[PDB]
Amino acid sequence: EVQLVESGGGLVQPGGSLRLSCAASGFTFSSYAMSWVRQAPGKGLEWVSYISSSSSYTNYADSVKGRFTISRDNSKNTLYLQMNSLRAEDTASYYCARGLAGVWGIDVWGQGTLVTVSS
Amino acid sequence: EGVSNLVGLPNNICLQKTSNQILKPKLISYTLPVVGQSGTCITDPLLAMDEGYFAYSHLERIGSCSRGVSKQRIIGVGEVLDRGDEVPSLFMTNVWTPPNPNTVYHCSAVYNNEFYYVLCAVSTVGDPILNSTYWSGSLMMTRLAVKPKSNGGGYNQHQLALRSIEKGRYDKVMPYGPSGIKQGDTLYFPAVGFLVRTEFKYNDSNCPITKCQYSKPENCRLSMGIRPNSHYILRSGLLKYNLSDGENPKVVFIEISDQRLSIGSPSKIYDSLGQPVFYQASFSWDTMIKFGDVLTVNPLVVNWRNNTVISRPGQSQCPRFNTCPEICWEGVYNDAFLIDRINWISAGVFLDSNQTAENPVFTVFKDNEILYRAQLASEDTNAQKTITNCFLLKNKIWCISLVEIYDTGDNVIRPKLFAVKIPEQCT
Ligand SMILES: *[C@@H]1O[C@H](CO)[C@@H](O[C@@H]2O[C@H](CO)[C@@H](O[C@@H]3O[C@H](CO[C@H]4O[C@H](CO)[C@@H](O)[C@H](O)[C@@H]4O)[C@@H](O)[C@H](O[C@H]4O[C@H](CO)[C@@H](O)[C@H](O)[C@@H]4O)[C@@H]3O)[C@H](O)[C@H]2NC(C)=O)[C@H](O)[C@H]1NC(C)=O
């Protein structure tokens, strides 16, 4: 049907980098949004990056402007969320899903990936 | 190709009453599996679809739902595309949040050329319809669009500041409606005016007192207000916005005709097969569905289709299938999109229970009959507000509905999306 896998790990020291990756099976990856969403333990969904089709518009979640940078690839289905200079307020789980944000979920979310910032 | 509105001659659909489970609604709102408590109750939904562009608005309140502090006011716009399986889905393209979430109430939406104008109300005293004798009266208008062209200026957030509202004989106007219509250079938002109760003209003769021996003849007069002893009555109608005239556009109000007049409630006017159809939510004694064809625009004449097979549930004081006047401002929003006008058929998500709102069902019904029903939830699932908008896929007809079902997986009333395919052939 539709498979969206979120790889990557956590348990990092405040201040550094992280190279997240995503997977896509089923729907066409070059024609859909496929944005990122963040879920903190105890909090709700927090949008962190939205990517459109072939680069025309990119919204970088002004709350965190220069810390994140999302990138898309139509040749190989993979959505990168390379993080730069992370902080302790980013300890949460990332999900690469169709649709920008809110409560709308196009397909099944999936397992996800855990990112921890401590020590 | 793509998602278009109802304009022309679509594929002929079944025109016979059948009950062999011909409808199969799917869900397009798979929510994240939240664990533990939620404390994120979602109230005040909004779903406006036009020309393949959809809008959404919801308020997240911490703790309870009636009395809870606001956290985030999300106003989103997006395109309507396919889900890879010939099923339409809502791809939201832009999301914005006002600075103060506890001041934005009762938004609207319309799409004229490339802007999804969201018309909300600014309130610093509470809720507009709840607090009417202390509300300022200022309105908020945001120009949301698709593909904001990041390498540009203010074409992602521009909030138009209304100069002044010119009311004919009203005091305060407020946009109360999910979706309106466009006519090139004139926007029409479904709204309601807070008219003075001591200056309203309604003779006590047009009241439907045919066979209402238990009812009282003086019930029609004291019914267009939120309370019997209220200073402001709700008069539904439209807000005309002329964005093509003057340096900065103005807003005027046009009231609904006196023909079958009721209290102001969340209304929606939508184009179909040509002309626009107007629906007013049954938040009054008239439990029957109130929708009809719009003849004129300036005086707002709307012929209401007398349908006596679909009603609205109440709170054990004004149940379904009730026609006589009764003082009860209790109801839920349950619209009905007109599919075909050669034979009057409308599809809407209603509640088949003459009790507390339960068991949402997608019903496609003709003038006086129930053609098709689809059960998308158990008889114990509770609902609060149902919005339904139909449109044209590649060649078929598909109806998207936002329903406030009780998500058993999260133990909270959560707005979920559903896509219903209109049966092409009965066989
Ligand atoms: C169920 O829903 C349908 C459609 O939605 C309703 O059908 C319409 O009902 C309205 C009711 O007002 C009708 O409007 C009236 O039609 C009368 C028909 O008169 C005929 O005969 C005269 C003879 O001279 C002709 O001139 C005329 O053209 C017709 O052929 C009109 O006479 C009425 O006008 C008079 O009354 C109005 C009342 O306000 C006055 O203002 C006028 O000045 C005039 O004195 C009026 O126009 C309408 O025609 C119906 N349409 C159809 C297609 O039938 C049903 O009524 C509704 N069911 C119920 C129970 O309400």
Contact between B102 and B172 (Cβ < 8 Å): no
Q: Measured between CA atoms, how close is B150 to chain A, in angstroms?
A: 5
Give the determination technique: cryo-EM
**Ligand 1, CB cutoff 6 Å, lining residues:** B 303, 305-306
b/e for B364-403, b at 16 or more Cβ within 10 A? bbbeeebbbbbebbeeebbbbbbbbbbbbbeeebbbbbbb
Residue of chain A with shortest Cα separation from B61: A44
Judge: B58–A100 Cβ closer than 8 Å, yes or no: no
B303 CA distance to ligand 1 middle (Å):
11
To which residue do tokens 């098709």 refer? B372
Give the DSSP letter of residue A2: -
Neighbours of B80 (CB within 10 A): 22
Boundaries of every domain in chain B: 1-30+339-427, 40-162, 194-331
Q: Does A57 touch chain B (CB under 8 A)?
A: yes
The Cα–Cα gap between B352 and B347 comes to 14
B74 to each of B39, B43, B46, B109, B176, how far by Cα in Å? Answer: 17, 12, 11, 14, 17
**What are the phi and psi torsion angles at B269 (to 5°)?**
-115, 130
Mutate to test the interface with B, among A2, A103, A107, A114 (most CBs of B within 10 A): A103
| CA atoms lying within 13 Å on the CB side of residue B343 | 11
Q: Does A93 touch chain B (CB under 8 A)?
A: no
Strands B251-255, B165-166: pairing is parallel
Q: Does B205 touch chain A (CB under 8 A)?
A: no
Q: How would DSSP label each residue in B10-66? A: ------S---S-----EE--------S----EEES--EEEETTEEEEEEEEEEE-SS
The Cα–Cα gap between B265 and B223 comes to 12
B323 to each of B262, B355, B362, how far by Cα in Å? Answer: 12, 16, 23
Q: Does A109 touch chain B (CB under 8 A)?
A: yes
Judge: A28–B84 Cβ closer than 8 Å, yes or no: yes
Contact between A101 and A37 (Cβ < 8 Å): yes
| 3-class secondary-structure state, position A40 | coil
Residues of chain A with C-beta less than 8 angstroms from the C-beta of B34: 44
Question: For chain B, how far is it from start to end, CA to CA, in angstroms?
Answer: 26
Atom of ligand 1 nearest to the CA of B303: 5
Residue of chain A with shortest Cα separation from B416: A104
B61 CA distance to ligand 1 middle (Å):
49
Residue of chain B with shortest Cα separation from A95: B32
Residue range A1-100 forms a domain whose CATH class is mainly beta
Boundaries of every domain in chain A: 1-100
Atom of ligand 1 nearest to the CA of B292: 5
Contact between B194 and B234 (Cβ < 8 Å): yes
> Which B residues, 228 through 257, put their C-beta within 8 Å of a C-beta on chain A?
none
To which residue do tokens 């409560």 refer? A103
Residue of chain B with shortest Cα separation from A26: B84
The continuous run of DSSP H or E covering B194 comes out as: strand B187-196
Q: CB-based contacts of A29: which residues, under 8 Å, 6+ apart? A: A74, A77, A79
Nearest beta carbon to residue B84 from set A26, A58, A100: A26
Neighbours of A7 (CB within 10 A): 15
Pocket test for ligand 1, best of B211, B294, B306 (most atoms within 8 A of CB): B306
The Cα–Cα gap between B186 and B201 comes to 29
Q: Does B36 touch chain A (CB under 8 A)?
A: yes
The Cα–Cα gap between B148 and B155 comes to 6
